[PDB]
Structure 1
Amino acid sequence: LTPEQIIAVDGAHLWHPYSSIGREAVSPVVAVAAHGAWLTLIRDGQPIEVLDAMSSWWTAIHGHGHPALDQALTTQLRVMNHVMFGGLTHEPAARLAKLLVDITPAGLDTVFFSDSGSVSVEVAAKMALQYWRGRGLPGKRRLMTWRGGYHGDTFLAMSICDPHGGMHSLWTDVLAAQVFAPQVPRDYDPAYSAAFEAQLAQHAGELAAVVVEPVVQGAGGMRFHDPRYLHDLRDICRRYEVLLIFDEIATGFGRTGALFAADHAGVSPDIMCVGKALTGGYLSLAATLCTADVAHTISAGAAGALMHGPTFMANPLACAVSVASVELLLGQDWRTRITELAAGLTAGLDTARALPAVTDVRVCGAIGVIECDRPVDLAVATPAALDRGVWLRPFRNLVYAMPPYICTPAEITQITSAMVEVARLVGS
């Protein structure tokens, strides 16, 4: 198909994330290749090379078409594409489970593979609910979180997303009614944690779990919070016998400057979700980890089992690529790499602080954010960044990047320069 033919088919037949059919303000741009940190996009009938500043929605940590990851896929393809995980096991699943148990916060000893982040969150909730039912406390079935969060798009996951960001107003009478604490602040305030505890105290008997994104909240507003809040959450959850669940689907695998964001606080949750960067952005795969205690309690319960089992559970191809991606990350000095990337983002975005339409500039690991004083018009921002050789996708009032770890210092400054120029145009 030609790019023009692709556009015609797309406009007629393809839904996009959070999109309409037939009411799009701008056509999507045709992507024809991806290699390293670069995408080849069609603009005015011509191929152009642009930096993937978004890592293709947090996924492409090692860039596209990395030789080690490409080879991991084709090596596995030669032997076994897939087998059902019901009654069978295999080397890719075992290798990946061993790795994940080793590198995640201490105590996360069992691994449930699924096919997406939203599913992994539903699995986490199911683990928590079956856990309490295994303890003879079925009343513990609600979830508590703080505002500003995002946990996916399936119906239970929706229930713990930020009520405003998640448009809960459109879902009246449909979603499970969960417990929401106020937005967690950036700076550490003991009064916030005291208030969180006071609220949890009123609901402890009906709460299965607290579920949060640690350190960085992604789709709900690219907000950062002091890691000390995670200490407090761990303490509150321990004292009130409520499970702690960390959704690290966006934060995992080095993105915030620690291997997992929980590591910034030395905190171990009872249950943990991972996903976006798990396969280095090749293939859909997610995992939910839980402690031995949680696993045993579920296993000794009425069902005698966790009542979940995806068709493509532990897919050999996805697991094989994930093994290679995780090993590639661990086999290099990733911490120095992310530190250098963060320094590049900080240096490159500093000039944005003086722009008339800029409210805040913030960086956490390989994440850089320009917060603007108005919603960013994509019809202007997207081509402006493309004109500067960068693929950027703002949302709401935020111009942000989470670049591939393989970006050179020069590429990082090209990304930040495009971001600054987008922010300048916002104020025009």
Structure 2
Amino acid sequence: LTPEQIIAVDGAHLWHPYSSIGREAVSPVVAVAAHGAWLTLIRDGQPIEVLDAMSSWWTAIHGHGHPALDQALTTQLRVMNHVMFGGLTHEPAARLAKLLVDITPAGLDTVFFSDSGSVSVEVAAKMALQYWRGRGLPGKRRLMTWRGGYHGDTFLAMSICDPHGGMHSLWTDVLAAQVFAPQVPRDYDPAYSAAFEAQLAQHAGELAAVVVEPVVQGAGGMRFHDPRYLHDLRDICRRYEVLLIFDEIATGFGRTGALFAADHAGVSPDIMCVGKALTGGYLSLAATLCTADVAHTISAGAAGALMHGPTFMANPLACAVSVASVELLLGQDWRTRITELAAGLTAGLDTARALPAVTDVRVCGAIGVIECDRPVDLAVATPAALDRGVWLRPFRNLVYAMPPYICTPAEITQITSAMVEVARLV
């Protein structure tokens, strides 16, 4: 298929994330290649190389086509593509589970693999709910969160997504009605935590778990909060006997300047989800981790088993490329790398602070955000970044990047300048 034939087929037959068929002011750009930190896109019939400033939606932490990750995939392909995980186990699953148990916040001892972040979140909720039935408290079945969050697109995951971001308006009422605390602020205010505790207190007997994104709220608006709020949640969840779930699907594997965002706070959740960067952006894969107590309580319970089992659970190919991805991250000084990227983003985005349309410029690890005072027009922003050799995808009033860890200073400089110039045009 030629690029023009790809466009014709796509327009007629392909749905895209949160998109229409037949409407679409877009239309999407044909990608023909991806290597390192660069994508090859078709603009006016011609292939152009542009920086993947988004890491292809958080995924490509080591960049596309990393030789070590290509090799791990092809190596596994020669031995065993996939076997069913019902009644069988294998080396890739074992090696990955061992790695993930060792590097996650302490006490997360057991690993349940799935095929996407939304599924790992449902699994997390199912673990939490079965946990309390296993304790003789089936009333503990609702979830609590703070606003601004995003947890996935499946129906349970939607119920804890921000009611505006997730447009709960169009969903009244098919969704579970969950407990929402106000938006967690940027700066630390103990009054916020006190009010969170009081709100939780009156719901405690009906709550299975608090579920939040730690430090960084991604898809719901790229907000950062003081990690000390996670210490308070841990404390509140402990005292009131409610499980704590950290959704680290966007934040894990070094992205926020710590290995997991939880590490900023020195706290361990009872249940943890990981996903987007797990395979270094090659293949869909996720995992849900829980403590020994959670695993045993579920297992000793009436049901005697966690009632979940995706067809492709613990896929050898995705597990093997993930092993190589995690070892590649751990085998380098990743902390210095992220610090430098963060500094590169801080220096490059600085001039944007003075722009008349800009309300905030903020950085956390390898994440850089320019927040504006009005929606960013995509028909203006997108070609503008392309002219500058950068792939950027703004949403709402935000211009932002989550660049691959392998971006050089020159590349960060190029990413930031394109971001600044999108903000100038606003």
Q: TM-score, normalised by structure 1?
A: 0.99
CA drift at 1:214: 0.1
Identity of aligned residues (%): 100
Q: Distance in 2 between matches of 1:293 and 1:127?
A: 11
1:298-354 residue CA offsets vs partner (Å, 9 max, x unmatched): 001111100000000000000000000000000000000000000000000000001
Cα distance in 2 for residues equivalent to 1:127 and 1:378? 40
Question: For the residues of structure 2 that align with 1:30 and 1:368, how far apart are their CA atoms?
Answer: 26
Deviations 1:106-137 (A, max 9, x none): 00000000000000000000000000000000
1:275-319: CA deviations, max 9, x gaps?
A: 000000000000000000000000011111000000000000000
CA distance in 2, matches of 1:270, 1:363: 28
Q: Shift of the alpha carbon at 1:6?
A: 0.1
Match of 1:119 in 2: 119
Q: SS in structure 2 opposite 1:70? A: helix
Counterpart of 2:374 in 1: which secondary structure? coil
| Alpha-carbon separation, structure 1, partners of 2:416 and 2:115 | 33
Pairwise CA RMSD? 0.3
CA shift for structure 1 position 33: 0.2
Matching of residue 421 in structure 1 with residue 421 in structure 2: yes
What whole-Å deviation, never above 9, does each CA across 1:49-108 have from its counterpart, x for those lacking one? 000000000000000000000000000000000000000000000000000000000000
Q: Distance in 1 between matches of 2:134 and 2:281?
A: 36
The equivalent residue for 1:101 is 101
Distance between the aligned counterparts of 1:337 and 1:149, measured in 2?
28
In structure 2, the partner of 1:269 is: 269
Trace 1:211-250 onto structure 2 (pairs within 5 A): 211-250=211-250
CA deviations 1:143-173 (Å, max 9, x no partner) are 0000000000000000000001100000001
Deviations 1:158-189 (A, max 9, x none): 00000011000000010000000000000000
What residue in structure 1 maps to residue 405 of structure 2? Answer: 405
> What CA distance in whole angstroms lies between the structure 2 residues aligned with 1:223 and 1:141?
28
Shift of 1:217: 0.2
Indicate the SS of the match to 2:399.
strand
Aligned residue number for residue 63 of structure 2: 63
Shift of 1:16: 0.1
Distance in 2 between the 1:312 and 1:396 partners?
Answer: 35
What is the alpha-carbon distance in structure 2 between the residues aligned to residue 381 and residue 122 of structure 1? Answer: 35
Question: Secondary structure, in 3 states, of the residue corresponding to 2:394?
Answer: coil
- 1:324 counterpart residue number: 324
Match of 1:173 in 2: 173
Hey, what's the Cα distance between the residues in 1 that align with 2:229 and 2:272?
17
Q: Distance in 2 between matches of 1:209 and 1:27?
A: 41
What is the rounded CA distance, in whole Å, between the counterparts of 2:117 and 2:279 in structure 1?
Answer: 12
What CA deviation, in whole Å up to 9, does each residue of 1:3-36 have, x standing for no partner?
A: 0000000000000000000000011000000000
CA–CA distance in 2 between the matches of 1:268 and 1:26? 42
SS at match of 1:63: coil
Partner residue in 2 for 1:358: 358
Determine the C-alpha separation between the residues in 1 that align with 2:371 and 2:173.
33
Structure 1 moving runs of 4+ over 4 Å: none
Secondary structure class of the residue paired with 2:39: strand
The SS at the match of 1:122 is helix
Measured after TM superposition, the shift of residue 198 of structure 1 is 0.3
Task: Find the residue that maps to 2:365 and give its secondary structure.
Answer: coil
Shift in Å at residue 404 of structure 1?
0.1
> Aligned equivalents of 2:302 and 2:58: distance in 1?
39
3-state DSSP class of the match of 1:202? helix
Question: How far apart in 2 are the matches of 1:371 and 1:151?
Answer: 22
Shift of 1:272: 0.1
**What secondary structure sits across from 2:198 in the alignment?**
helix
Q: Deviations over 1:362-381 (max 9, x none)?
A: 00000000000001111110
Within a 5 Å distance, the mapping from 1:371-382 to structure 2 comes to 371-382=371-382
CA–CA distance in structure 2, aligned partners of residues 356 and 169 of structure 1 = 33
For the residues of structure 2 that align with 1:269 and 1:46, how far apart are their CA atoms? 49
Q: 1:203 is paired with a residue of what secondary structure?
A: helix
Q: Distance in 1 between matches of 2:365 and 2:83?
A: 38
Partner secondary structure for residue 296 of structure 1: helix
Deviations 1:246-287 (A, max 9, x none): 000000000000000000000000000000000000000000
| Residue-pair matches, total | 426
Instruction: For structure 2, list consecutive stretches of 5 or more residues without a partner in the other structure.
Output: none
How far did 1:209 drift? 0.1
Look up the SS of the partner of 1:273 in the other structure: strand
Give unmatched runs, 5+ long, in structure 1. none
Cα separation, 2, equivalents of 1:379 and 1:311: 41
Alpha-carbon separation, structure 2, partners of 1:173 and 1:255: 36
Q: What secondary structure sits across from 1:254 in the alignment?
A: coil
Distance in 1 (CA, whole Å) between partners of 2:173 and 2:257 is 40
**Which residue is equivalent to 1:190?**
190
CA-to-aligned-CA distance 1:380-424 (integer Å, 9 cap, x gap): 101000000000000010000000000000000000000000000
Question: Partners of 2:117 and 2:190 in 1: how far apart?
Answer: 32
Q: CA deviation at 1:226?
A: 0.2
User: Which residue pairs with 2:143 in the alignment?
Assistant: 143
Which residue does the alignment assign to 2:392? 392
